[PDB]
Amino acid sequence: ADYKIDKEGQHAFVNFRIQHLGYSWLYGTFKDFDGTFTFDEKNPAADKVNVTINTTSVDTNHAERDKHLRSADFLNTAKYPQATFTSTSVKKDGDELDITGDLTLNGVTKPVTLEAKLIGQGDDPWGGKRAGFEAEGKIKLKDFNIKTDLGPASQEVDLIISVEGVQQK
Amino acid sequence: ADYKIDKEGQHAFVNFRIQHLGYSWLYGTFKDFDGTFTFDEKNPAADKVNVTINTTSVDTNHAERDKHLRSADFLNTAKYPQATFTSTSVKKDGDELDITGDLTLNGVTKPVTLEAKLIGQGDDPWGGKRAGFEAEGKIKLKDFNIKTDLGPASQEVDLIISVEGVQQK
Ligand SMILES: CC(C)=CCC/C(C)=C/CC/C(C)=C/CC/C(C)=C/CC/C(C)=C/CC/C(C)=C/CC/C(C)=C/CC/C(C)=C/Cc1ccccc1O
Ligand SMILES: CC(C)=CCC/C(C)=C/CC/C(C)=C/CC/C(C)=C/CC/C(C)=C/CC/C(C)=C/CC/C(C)=C/CC/C(C)=C/Cc1ccccc1O
């Protein structure tokens, strides 16, 4: 079935974390994004996913740091107001889904794989059908032209994802 | 040594997640908190921790839902503008710390245990000493008089914590 990510009720989250000086985890989120996805429990190879993110909506709960994350030193949102992820391959791996796709971030497109898992699906208390998932992945900062070094412990960023979809059609 | 949680550079996060209809994970965060902590790597029994959280600063990236979280139906911030955590016992459990303490949430004080771990410690690029930790815990909603039911899969909330301290004295 085809699904629409629940942006209206915001039961979708694109979070992330990366170490700070190798001393602690720095958490953040991208508050403005949307997307769709096809989920067929019997035929996993037919699954799809297409999401758009407005990178300017990054939030790590610090005005100054975020102003810096939007700068040309990092996300460079003025030049690339958007990050985008489109699947190219999906394959069932036991009780999980390995989602391979093209990530266009900071001007560069490179394939990244996410490990997703069905949390639950079923009826809506309002007459709709839903399906939610949790996912993980990593992004090597250098691969997407983000040169500003953050230390040996901070070369890649952990992606903590969770989306609830509303069945379409 | 005594530490002051880095609220200035906000290298501290009090996050949480709970399921939505057993379909997906709903993430949130408390943007306004402060605190201190004593860390002695050799004598873990002397460790302390005291944090204050302005519950009104809750954020799940949805204005409506958050207005509801502040309401009498949940956090009841108008009556109780603050949550508070004071350790009462700390003991080394192998390579981690089990921090027991009193949590005053929504008017009720009950002991909750956190499982923390040292991420790293060392010198500052600015001449200070730091030590960061990651921690986990669970809060049973009913225990703290948060009656409004969210379903069988949503009885307790996952606490995802990370704090970096700046050595005092
Ligand atoms: C097919 C099917 C059935 C589907 C199931 C449903 C699913 C699971 C579909 C997937 C859904 C979604 C939304 C998938 C999204 C996938 C992807 C790959 C999204 C891309 C997200 C994205 C925009 C990546 C950006 C991540 C990055 C690079 C974050 C920046 C982190 C960063 C630099 C932090 C800086 C850290 C640091 C120590 C800064 C120091 C610092 C600087 C200045 C002042 C103070 C200070 O402390
Ligand atoms: C000792 C030493 C060396 C220290 C190491 C360093 C450490 C690790 C020190 C600890 C540092 C800190 C900060 C420790 C903090 C500890 C604690 C226990 C903090 C308490 C935090 C707190 C305020 C708890 C609140 C959690 C709660 C109850 C969240 C509420 C969310 C809730 C009910 C969820 C809504 C879910 C739901 C399905 C909503 C319904 C709904 C309504 C409307 C629209 C949409 C919708 O979905």
CA–CA dist A142, A156 (Å, integer): 8
Neighbours of A73 (CB within 10 A): 11
Contacts of A92 (CB under 8 A, 6+ apart): A44, A98
Q: What is the DSSP string of B141-166?
A: TGGGT------TT-SEEEEEEEEEEE
The total number of structural domains in chain A stands at 1
Ligand 1: distance of its center to the CA of B151 in Å? 30
- Measured distance between the N- and C-terminal CA atoms of chain A, rounded to whole angstroms: 8
Mutate to test the interface with A, among B17, B18, B23 (most CBs of A within 10 A): B23
CA–CA dist A75, A59 (Å, integer): 12
Which residues form the domain of A141? 1-169
Neighbours of B158 (CB within 10 A): 15
CA B163 to chain centre: 9
Cβ-defined contacts of A57-64 (< 8 Å, 24+): A57/A30, A57/A31, A57/A32, A57/A33, A58/A28, A58/A29, A58/A30, A58/A31, A59/A28, A59/A29, A59/A30, A59/A31, A60/A26, A60/A27, A60/A28, A60/A29, A60/B10, A61/A28, A61/B10, A61/B13, A61/B29, A61/B31, A62/B9, A62/B10
How far apart, in Å, are the Cα atoms of B95 and each of B45, B70, B92, B110, B165? 14, 37, 7, 26, 19
What is residue A57's DSSP assignment? G
- CA of A135, closest CA in chain B: separation in Å? 11
SS percent in chain B: helix, strand, coil, step 5: 10, 55, 35
* Cross-strand partners of B89: B100
All residues of chain B having their beta carbon less than 8 Å from the beta carbon of residue A119 are 19, 22-25
B67 to chain A, any CB pair closer than 8 A? The answer is no
Contacts of B116 (CB under 8 A, 6+ apart): B96, B97, B98, B99, B133, B134, B135, B136, B161
Q: Whose CA is closest to A145, among A108, A113, A91, A94? A: A108
Phi then psi dihedrals of residue A127, to 5 deg: 90, 20
Q: Whose CA is closest to A162, among A123, A125, A114, A102? A: A114
Q: Whose CA is closest to B164, among B139, B140, B129, B137? A: B129
Query: Encoding tokens for residue B55?
Result: 């519950």
CA–CA dist A109, A119 (Å, integer): 29
CA–CA dist A22, A27 (Å, integer): 13
Half-sphere exposure of B105 (CA within 13 A, CB side): 23
CATH of residue B126's domain is: 2.40.128.110
* Cross-strand partners of B156: B140
- CA of B142, closest CA in chain A: separation in Å? 23
For the CA of A12, the nearest atom of ligand 1: 13
Q: What is the DSSP string of A139-160?
A: EEGGGGT------GGGSEEEEE
- Kindly state if the Cβ of A131 falls inside 6 Å of ligand 1: no
B29 to chain A, any CB pair closer than 8 A? The answer is yes
CA–CA dist B97, B144 (Å, integer): 24
Ligand 2: distance of its center to the CA of A64 in Å? 25
How far apart, in Å, are the Cα atoms of A11 and each of A107, A162, B98, B112, B114? 28, 8, 32, 28, 27
Residue recorded with tokens 């790597």: B41
Which method was used? X-ray
* Burial per residue of B47-59, b for 16 or more beta-carbon CB atoms within 10 angstroms, e otherwise: bbbebebebbbbb
